[PDB]
Design a protein around this motif. Structure first.
Motif, PDB file in Angstrom:
ATOM      1  N   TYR A  84      -1.527  -1.929  -7.240  1.00 26.13           N
ATOM      2  CA  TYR A  84      -1.080  -1.940  -5.852  1.00 26.13           C
ATOM      3  C   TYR A  84       0.310  -2.550  -5.731  1.00 26.13           C
ATOM      4  O   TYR A  84       1.092  -2.160  -4.857  1.00 26.13           O
ATOM      5  CB  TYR A  84      -2.076  -2.707  -4.979  1.00 26.13           C
ATOM      6  N   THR A 130     -10.647  -5.698 -11.699  1.00 25.65           N
ATOM      7  CA  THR A 130      -9.961  -6.493 -10.689  1.00 25.65           C
ATOM      8  C   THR A 130      -8.514  -6.751 -11.081  1.00 25.65           C
ATOM      9  O   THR A 130      -7.609  -6.643 -10.248  1.00 25.65           O
ATOM     10  CB  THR A 130     -10.702  -7.810 -10.473  1.00 25.65           C
ATOM     11  N   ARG A 172      -6.707  -3.521 -10.373  1.00 27.43           N
ATOM     12  CA  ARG A 172      -6.517  -3.180  -8.966  1.00 27.43           C
ATOM     13  C   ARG A 172      -5.290  -3.874  -8.396  1.00 27.43           C
ATOM     14  O   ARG A 172      -4.539  -3.281  -7.612  1.00 27.43           O
ATOM     15  CB  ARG A 172      -7.753  -3.562  -8.153  1.00 27.43           C
ATOM     16  N   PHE A 173      -5.073  -5.131  -8.779  1.00 28.42           N
ATOM     17  CA  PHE A 173      -4.001  -5.910  -8.169  1.00 28.42           C
ATOM     18  C   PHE A 173      -2.635  -5.482  -8.683  1.00 28.42           C
ATOM     19  O   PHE A 173      -1.674  -5.394  -7.910  1.00 28.42           O
ATOM     20  CB  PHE A 173      -4.227  -7.397  -8.435  1.00 28.42           C
TER      21      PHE A 173
END
Ligand code: CLA
Ligand code: CLA
Ligand code: CLA
Ligand code: CLA
Ligand code: CLA
Ligand code: CLA
Ligand code: CLA
Ligand code: CLA
Ligand SMILES: CC1=C(/C=C/C(C)=C\C=C/C(C)=C/C=C/C=C(C)/C=C\C=C(C)\C=C\C2=C(C)CCCC2(C)C)C(C)(C)CCC1
Ligand SMILES: CC1=C(C/C=C(\C)CCC[C@H](C)CCC[C@H](C)CCCC(C)C)C(=O)c2ccccc2C1=O
Ligand code: SF4
Ligand code: SF4
Ligand code: SF4
Lengths: 80, 141, 105, 105, 730, 163, 64
Positions: free
Chosen positions: F56, F49, F52-53
């Motif tokens: 992006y 997680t 992922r942030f």
């Protein structure tokens, strides 16, 4: 009160006559085919419009067509 | 045939207890159908309406309310037992009409006496569009 | 009100938890149920003609199957309907029950 | 005769069973809850079932003397609690349980 | 009983009764028909539909004036709720009349949802007396049309066939008089009456001759100083009823909305219907009719033939095809009317034309949904009635080489490309929705595929919306398009579009992107279902001669693998399901996007409309709380009538599934069993039917089940739409 | 930036959504012991997680007021503002793969129809032939324009019509 | 000889036919004055299941 018309492409297979239960189709002699036979539809008043005959016809397209129309007691298959 | 066989309304019927698929009020008022045939021995056969019944050696007679119920039985007898049935049509007025072997020969066999009916001398298709007959009935006739 | 609009709160609010699979199956089951209606309500006549206009394009590009495509049979159409119909009708409850009851009340 | 007599029963049930549900809906929307079919109302209680519950409940005394207790607690008795949760307790039949049992038939 | 058809009258069964109604107004297939008698019977019948319209309008006026609160509503339009008609149901109880008497009236009533109060109030109606006088006027006009349908059927007063086939005279009279002069007069009403009634002046039949609309009068009109009528417009601080903040203008081009009543300026709409009258009168003098000047219709079509031959003969042979085919003329009219009906829906919610309509949230919904649903029904008829043309009124030899035969020649390409668009749109739209449904479910809401609709935001920037920052020509002060129309329309237009509290060009996100793409899939597939039934109406490989049978027939039998649902009627039958599905999405998207706006929380739609569970959770399940509690075991509110109807729709929709799923053969064997019982019963057998009972036909059941299917698909939503919006009041 | 969208790095709601999604795992992580396998599973999900942030944000994505990333489709704005990998480049990647499936199936159909009993070859495939064509389709665009410019792609009115 | 040769392929021109603008082998030809003498056989079946049909002289033409 249905309509049954047979066309020029009949070949005298007799499979239409054997199929229709109500005896609305019979064979008549003719000079157009090898078998020297052709169908006919003398008594369409007894036609129930089942359309089994068309299925029997083994030509590219049907030489026998049952054009549905006005109904009646005999056509609706009413025992009552 | 040589001559139409007139109806014998008093012949023995098969041995059948009865059922609910029999005749209704339409038969007495409008019309009903009866079928005749001649068997060589005592056999068992399936009725169109109901269950099984036992034929009788000699003439037999049934009464039905539809022509399909009668012709359904001819196809069974001609195939299984190889017989030659003949059936009529009876109106409420007492008039009688001889229908199926109308020429004596079954329809699937030719005969010289017959005349063609509803015979178009053209191919399927190859017929006028509905616009040409827009205000009266029929594109196929 | 008291059975559907109430007990459906545990299934709807399952996103973001271990019961999330029931929330998906809850929707998936509605899709397969409705999808059956195409088969029950319509008939093999409309479909067989549509395939002919599709066969033209597949024929135009010389990419066509030797096994001719034919529409599903009348009897099969009816069977395909009740199957996708029962599956969607039954699977909904299977999601609407287990999510409701595992999250007790 | 079979199909005819059986057709009459289905129409008899669907009217007198499902029609009772619509009567309660229509009475409630019109503001006439006194005229519904319910416990505080025009009660239709299943006497035959209620009598069978007590008979199977009072069986250990008379009809099955060596039986220490009844077959299940659904007939009648006291609650059986396990882990702070009830395993089984007597089920009471009323006006609603009368309509549903008929709806099934 | 059918006298127009002897074939059905001889039928002994109940099929006579059903088919007698459905073939009633199909004059072509009737017995003893003629082309001249056909047009006359239509001309008389079209007078009838007018008679019901003018009476239907008269009933609303009377039932509103007699039972409504129009006098009380004008004084406080925002807070007071309108009243449609009163209620007398003796099966009520005392709690219901106490709940349904919410209005100021004594007895129980029904709150209106049409919006006629906002409409009548705008055009200058301020009393119940004026509605009584009007209800009498239309009832007179209604009776006059009935007298005409009978009069213009008599031996004399009977128009000839040449009179009907005079297209050049019909266009000129209808474009100039029906459209133009009517639009000219409506401007005469807005000027002489309505604008004064807004500014306090009471104008009526007593004083309309003495009162001037403008102080100067007509002397500017003759002198040429036509700008005098736009000098002193109404100010922003203007109450719609009183003269506070008034002006003297009658024609102006202010643009935008009125501040208090979020609606269009009356002086603009007066100026609007004037210019429309001028173009339509000018267009009316185009075609040739009994004088040397004018165009001819046939000469034009024969001329527009391209030389190279991309269209072959071109538009030749089409004039006699259109003028002689009534189904052709009907498909084009429905196609045009159907589309217009959608414009009325799209352009009213964004540009409110009436006073205090933007505030009535329940009323905006119903009107938008009612027009959208009718749009689809009218559009379906245009194709269907377009398919009947190919069967009955199409001549190939006359229309040889023209555009109409060249389309029908390569139809396999059209139906193929349409299928590809629907498949690609359907697969991608469902995929994006699923991909987001899952990835939300695993707790990762950032992995969604959210694509911004850049092309639409590019337009709103090119039409005044400065939010997106594209800085296009009309969002840029330096461009000429901003310079032009700067004095005219832009100050009022730019203020409204940039305001984010109105429905004029709402903000767009990635959630609005998926909804638009889903719509496109529905519109393309619906056309494909219809287009196929039209082009393949004449023949298919499975049935080379459909034209001989007709538009509507059962099937050609179980042969050739099965031919059930081939006829063009069965294509229209299947499209209605899709039509309702398409309008459903279009309408579901309007309601939720507006509820979030009215509730103030726009973030609800933007974040939750990207995945399907949001539609089931936040829109359907949530807003169905106040509705479902209409009749609780504790008590009942005023929304009980809607919850009852709510279920009533859910039920009717399910009853149609019987006629759709279960076919005939199961039932006719069942009716044969009841017939046996009716005769064998001891006493009932004495009674005997006059017409024999039989099951419903194949085509009849497709129709009946679709009616039970569509009525449930409308009564269910109407309750949900009105109850959800009315209970929250926002 | 464009269309009134902030980058995902500068957004507050984007970081708010990160702090939320991690708080759920930290609460879920308190129940289990440190060295257990449920602990290792949740720590990995925490590691993914967090990855992922940041990835992006590093990729110049555009996040709206809701805090979620938005995609841009016009190649002009995509190339001008450096957002081409989102949609414009995924389109060419898919078309090469989609064309490969078409050029392969089209060739297997044509070649099996040049022999006897092509119906059997569809239900019972010639796997040696199918693999041969499947590894020969890397340059499918060349063959298409070769076949178009030649004229052996399309058939010419030897197809069935209906009227 | 009246018509096409035995074993020769020909193209059909009946608009009604399932085999229209399609090719088939000539099985036989009758020379007794029949209206539809030419017997043709195709590999592909029609909707019913029949792969042969008697066509006429004018209704058939040379291949491709
Ligand atoms: C909500 C939808 C719905 C409804 C209302 C029905 C209703 C019925 N079904 Mg169907 N069924 C349905 C769905 C539905 N079905 C679907 C979708 C399928 C597809 C599988 C089936 C398939 C099916 C089959 C094959 C059969 C039935 C049968 C029946 C009938 C059973 C007899 C009966 O109970 O009637 C009782 C009456 C009612 C239940 C109506 C309840 C509403 C109230 C009581 C009516 C109130 C009348 C009102 C007071 C009068 C107003 C008059 C006004 C003009 C002023 C009944 C009419 C069976 C049948 O007809 O044979 C007996 C039959 O065999 N059903
Ligand atoms: C300007 C409008 C207009 C005009 C003048 C016509 C004229 C005609 N149409 Mg057409 N049509 C129109 C609009 C129009 N249509 C639209 C908008 C559609 C799309 C829905 C159609 C779809 C259509 C079809 C599909 C057919 C026609 C047919 C016909 C012909 C007459 C058939 C007849 O007598 O039926 C009389 C029929 C009835 C009296 C039955 C109608 C009953 C309705 C469906 C029930 C409605 C529900 C119920 C009342 C709801 C009550 C609520 C409840 C809770 C109380 C005639 C040429 C037929 C034709 O030409 O046949 C070849 C035909 O097959 N039309
Ligand atoms: C305002 C709508 C309207 C109009 C103008 C007409 C007009 C007409 N109808 Mg009609 N009709 C309507 C609605 C309408 N109908 C409805 C809703 C129904 C269903 C109940 C019918 C059922 C109906 C039947 C059963 C018959 C007519 C007939 C007629 C014609 C009688 C001559 C006078 C006339 C053209 C008669 C006819 O065919 O005359 C030629 C006829 O027999 N109509
Ligand atoms: C098509 C137009 C139209 C419609 C739909 C209605 C509808 C209605 N009127 Mg009405 N009415 C109308 C025109 C119309 N009116 C006109 C033009 C007049 C003038 C004569 C009246 C005079 C009138 C009276 C005097 C009464 C009604 C009443 C009614 C209601 C009675 C129930 C019924 O079956 O009807 C109903 C809401 C009755 C009622 O109680 O309304 C609540 C009633 O007493 N109406
Ligand atoms: C598009 C045209 C149009 C329309 C729809 C209206 C509509 C209206 N006007 Mg208006 N008006 C118009 C043009 C129009 N006006 C013009 C051009 C003027 C300038 C003189 C006026 C001056 C005016 C005044 C001064 C008054 C109205 C009033 C009214 C209202 C009530 C009228 C009534 O009940 O009938 C009553 C009808 C009569 C008393 C007789 C009318 C006589 C005309 C010439 C008959 C026309 C019939 C027409 C041909 C019908 C079509 C069918 C045809 C086939 C027969 C209504 C809102 C009244 C009101 O209260 O509004 C606020 C009112 O006092 N109007
Ligand atoms: C059949 C395919 C198809 C169809 C029918 C539509 C239809 C529609 N799109 Mg659209 N779109 C498509 C494909 C399609 N799109 C593709 C592949 C993309 C890139 C992923 C987009 C990106 C896109 C955006 C950003 C927007 C729309 C919007 C719209 C709506 C307004 C028309 C418009 O301006 O968009 C553009 C029209 C096109 C791009 C036509 C191109 C279709 C090509 C030929 C098919 C694909 C070819 C392939 C990629 C190579 C409309 C209903 C607008 C909207 O949502 O309304 C508010 C809008 O903002 N579309
Ligand atoms: C067995 C239980 C049951 C059943 C069978 C139904 C059945 C039905 N309900 Mg329902 N409902 C139920 C329980 C049930 N409900 C409960 C418990 C509640 C809460 C108390 C509701 C509340 C409810 C409401 C508020 C509504 C319905 C509606 C409907 C009807 C819509 C049918 C349809 O196909 O429209 C079409 C179906 C759709 C358009 C899709 C469904 C919603 C999707 C997710 C929206 C997606 C839109 C968007 C464009 C994305 C799709 C595009 C796609 C390409 C991805 C239908 C007959 C609706 C109605 O009356 O019909 C108009 C309606 O508005 N129901
Ligand atoms: C080599 C196989 C192949 C090829 C080259 C094509 C090519 C084409 N098809 Mg198509 N189709 C196929 C198989 C194929 N199809 C199959 C198996 C089906 C049954 C599901 C369909 C159903 C179908 C429909 C309904 C439509 C097309 C359409 C089209 C055209 C537009 C592309 C499209 O969107 O189609 C759609 C693509 C699919 C439905 C996906 C097909 C399934 C897979 C992905 C392809 C099969 C590959 C094959 C099994 C592998 C064999 C390789 C071999 C070495 C073993 C296009 C020329 C459209 C059209 O008419 O053009 C205007 C259209 O409407 N096709
Ligand atoms: C089958 C048939 C048919 C069909 C029909 C139809 C269905 C049609 C259609 C359709 C439709 C219904 C359409 C519509 C439309 C519209 C359009 C197509 C449009 C447009 C465009 C434009 C040109 C625009 C422009 C503009 C302006 C004006 C300004 C601003 C901008 C814009 C761009 C918006 C018929 C009967 C004919 C005949 C035969 C049979
Ligand atoms: C139930 C059913 C029947 C039988 C249904 C019958 C006989 C009911 C019709 C007769 C009743 C008595 C009419 C009921 C009254 C209506 C509620 C109101 C009619 C109003 C009109 C007069 C306008 C079919 O014939 C049929 C045929 C084809 C597909 C499906 C079905 C089907 O589902
Ligand atoms: S079934 Fe057809 S081919 Fe055979 S004899 Fe009858 S008409 Fe001729
Ligand atoms: S319609 Fe049926 S009964 Fe009549 S001839 Fe054809 S097959 Fe025989
Ligand atoms: S409509 Fe009924 S009878 Fe006709 S082919 Fe279909 S299933 Fe058979």
């Amino acid at each position: 009160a249905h309509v049954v018309k047979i066309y020029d492409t009949c070949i005298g297979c007799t499979q239409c006559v054997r199929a229709c239960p109500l005896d609305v189709l019979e064979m008549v002699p003719w000079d157009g085919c090898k078998a020297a036979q052709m169908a006919s539809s003398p008594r369409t008043e007894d036609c129930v419009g089942c359309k089994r005959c068309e299925t029997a016809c083994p030509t590219d397209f049907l030489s026998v067509r049952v054009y549905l129309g006005n109904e009646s007691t005999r056509s609706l298959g009413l025992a009552y | 045939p040589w001559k139409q066989p007139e109806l014998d309304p008093d012949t023995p019927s098969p041995i059948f207890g009865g059922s609910t698929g029999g005749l209704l009020r339409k038969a007495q008022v409008e019309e009903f159908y009866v079928i005749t045939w001649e068997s060589p021995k005592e056999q068992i056969f399936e009725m169109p309406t109901g269950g099984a019944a036992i034929m009788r050696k000699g003439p037999n007679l049934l009464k039905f309310a539809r022509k399909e119920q009668c012709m359904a039985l001819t196809t069974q007898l001609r195939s299984k037992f190889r017989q030659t049935p003949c059936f009529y049509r009876v109106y409420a007025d007492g008039k009688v009409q001889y229908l199926h072997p109308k020429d004596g020969v079954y329809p699937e066999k030719v005969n010289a006496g017959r005349v063609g009916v509803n015979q178009n001398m053209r191919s399927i298709g190859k017929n006028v569009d509905p616009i040409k007959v827009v205000k009266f009935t029929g594109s196929e006739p | 009100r008291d059975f559907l609009w109430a007990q459906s709160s545990q299934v709807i609010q399952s996103y973001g938890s271990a019961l999330s699979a029931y929330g998906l199956m809850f929707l998936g089951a509605h899709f397969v149920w409705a999808f059956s209606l195409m088969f029950l309500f319509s008939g093999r006549g409309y479909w067989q003609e549509l395939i002919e206009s599709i066969v033209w394009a597949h024929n135009k590009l010389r990419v066509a199957p030797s096994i001719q495509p034919r529409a599903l049979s009348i009897t099969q159409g009816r069977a395909v309907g009740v199957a996708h119909y029962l599956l969607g009708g039954i699977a909904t409850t299977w999601s609407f029950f287990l999510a409701r009851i595992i999250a007790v009340g | 005769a079979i199909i005819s007599h059986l057709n009459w029963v289905s129409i008899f049930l669907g009217f007198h069973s499902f029609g009772l549900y619509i009567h309660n809906d229509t009475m409630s929307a019109l503001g006439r809850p006194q005229d519904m079919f319910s416990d505080t109302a025009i009660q239709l209680q299943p006497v035959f079932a209620q009598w069978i519950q007590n008979t199977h409940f009072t069986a250990p005394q008379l009809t099955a003397p060596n039986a220490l207790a009844a077959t299940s607690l659904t007939w009648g008795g006291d609650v059986v609690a396990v882990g702070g949760k009830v395993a089984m307790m007597p089920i009471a039949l009323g006006t609603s349980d009368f309509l549903v049992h008929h709806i099934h038939a | 009983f059918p006298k127009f058809s002897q074939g059905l009258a001889q039928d002994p069964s109940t099929r006579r009764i059903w088919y007698g109604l459905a073939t009633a107004h199909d004059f072509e297939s009737h017995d003893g028909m003629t082309e001249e008698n056909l047009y006359q019977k239509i001309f008389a019948s079209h007078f009838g539909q007018l008679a019901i319209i003018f009476l239907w309008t008269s009933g609303n006026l009377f039932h509103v004036a007699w039972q409504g609160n129009f006098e009380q509503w004008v004084t406080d339009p925002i807070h007071v709720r309108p009243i449609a008609h009163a209620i007398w149901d003796p099966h009520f109880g005392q709690p219901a009349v106490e709940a349904f008497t919410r209005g100021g009236a004594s007895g129980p009533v029904n709150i209106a949802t049409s919006g006629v109060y906002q409409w009548w109030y705008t055009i200058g109606l301020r009393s119940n007396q004026e509605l009584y006088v009007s209800s009498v006027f239309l009832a007179l006009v209604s009776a006059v049309f009935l007298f005409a349908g009978w009069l213009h059927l008599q031996p004399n007063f009977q128009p000839s066939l040449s009179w009907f086939k005079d297209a050049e005279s019909r266009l000129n009279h209808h474009l100039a008089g029906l459209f133009g002069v009517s639009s000219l007069a409506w401007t005469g009403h807005l000027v002489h009456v309505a604008i004064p009634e807004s500014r306090g002046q009471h104008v009526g039949w007593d004083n309309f001759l003495s009162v001037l609309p403008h102080p100067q009068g007509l002397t500017p009109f003759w002198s040429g100083n036509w700008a005098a009528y736009a000098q002193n417009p109404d100010t922003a601080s203007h109450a719609f009823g009183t003269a506070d903040g008034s002006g003297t203008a009658i024609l102006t081009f202010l643009g935008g909305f009125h501040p208090q009543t979020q609606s269009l300026w009356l002086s603009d709409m007066a100026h609007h219907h004037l210019a429309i009258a001028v173009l339509f009168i000018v267009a009316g003098h185009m075609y040739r009719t009994n004088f040397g000047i004018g165009h001819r219709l046939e000469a034009i079509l024969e001329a527009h033939t391209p030389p190279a031959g991309g269209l072959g003969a071109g538009h030749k042979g089409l004039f006699h095809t259109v003028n002689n085919s009534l189904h052709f003329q009907l498909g084009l009219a429905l196609a045009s009317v159907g589309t217009i009906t959608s414009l009325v829906a799209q352009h009213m919610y964004s540009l409110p034309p009436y006073a205090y309509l933007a505030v009535d949230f329940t009323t905006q919904a119903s009107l938008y949904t009612h027009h959208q649903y009718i749009a689809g029904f009218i559009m379906c008829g245009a194709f269907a009635h377009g398919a009947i043309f190919f069967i009955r009124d199409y001549d190939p030899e006359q229309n040889k080489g023209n555009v109409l035969a060249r389309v029908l020649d390569h139809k396999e390409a059209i139906i193929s490309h349409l299928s590809w668009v629907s498949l690609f749109l359907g697969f991608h739209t469902l995929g994006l929705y699923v991909h987001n449904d899952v990835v939300q479910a695993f707790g990762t809401p950032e992995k969604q595929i959210l694509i911004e609709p850049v092309f639409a935001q590019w337009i709103q920037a090119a039409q005044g919306k400065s939010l997106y920052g594209f800085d296009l020509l009309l969002a840029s002060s330096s461009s000429p398009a901003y310079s032009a129309g700067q004095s005219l329309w832009l100050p009022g237009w730019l203020e409204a579009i940039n305001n984010n509290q109105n429905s004029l060009f709402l903000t767009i996100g990635p959630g609005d992107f998926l909804v638009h793409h889903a719509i496109a899939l529905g519109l393309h597939t619906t056309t494909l279902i219809l287009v196929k039934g039209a082009l393949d109406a004449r023949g298919s490989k499975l049935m080379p001669d459909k034209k001989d049978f007709g538009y509507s027939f059962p099937c050609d039998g179980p042969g050739r693998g099965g031919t059930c649902d081939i006829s063009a009627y069965d294509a229209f039958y299947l499209a209605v399901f899709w039509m309702l599905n398409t309008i459903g999405w279009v309408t579901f998207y309007w309601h939720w996007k507006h509820l979030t706006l009215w509730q103030g929380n726009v973030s609800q739609f933007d974040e939750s409309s990207t995945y399907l569970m949001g539609w089931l959770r936040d829109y359907l399940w949530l807003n169905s709380s106040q509705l479902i509690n209409g009749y609780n075991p504790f008590g009942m509110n005023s929304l009980s009538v809607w919850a009852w109807t709510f279920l009533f729709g859910h039920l009717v929709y399910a009853t149609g599934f019987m006629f759709l799923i279960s076919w005939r053969g199961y039932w006719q064997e069942l009716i044969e069993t009841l017939v046996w019982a009716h005769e064998k019963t001891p006493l009932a057998n004495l009674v005997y039917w006059k017409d024999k009972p039989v099951a419903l036909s194949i085509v009849q059941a497709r129709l009946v089940g679709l009616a039970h299917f569509s009525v449930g698909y409308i009564f269910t939503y109407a309750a949900f739409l009105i109850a959800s919006t009315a209970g929250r009041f926002g | 930036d464009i269309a009134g969208l902030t980058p995902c790095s500068e957004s507050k709601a984007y970081n708010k959504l990160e702090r939320k999604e991690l708080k759920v795992l930290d609460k879920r992580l308190k129940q289990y012991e440190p060295g257990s396998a449920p602990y290792l599973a949740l720590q990995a999900t925490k590691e993914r997680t967090e990855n992922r942030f940041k990835t992006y944000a590093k990729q110049g994505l555009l996040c709206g007021n809701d805090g979620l990333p938005h995609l841009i489709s016009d190649p002009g704005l995509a190339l001008r503002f450096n957002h081409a990998g989102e949609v414009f480049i995924p389109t060419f990647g898919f078309l090469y793969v989609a064309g490969y499936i078409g050029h392969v199936g089209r060739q297997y159909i044509i070649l099996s129809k040049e022999d006897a009993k092509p119906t059997d070859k569809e239900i019972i495939l010639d796997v040696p032939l199918a693999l041969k064509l499947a590894f020969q389709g890397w340059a499918w665009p060349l063959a298409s324009i070769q076949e178009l410019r030649n004229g052996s792609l399309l058939e010419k009115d030897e197809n069935i019509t209906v009227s | 000889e009246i018509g096409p040769k035995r074993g020769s392929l020909v193209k059909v021109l009946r608009p009604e036919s399932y085999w229209y603008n399609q090719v088939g082998k000539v099985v036989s030809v009758d020379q007794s004055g029949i209206r539809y003498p030419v017997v043709v056989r195709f590999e592909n079946q029609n909707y019913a299941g029949v792969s042969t049909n008697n066509y006429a002289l004018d209704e058939i033409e040379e291949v491709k």
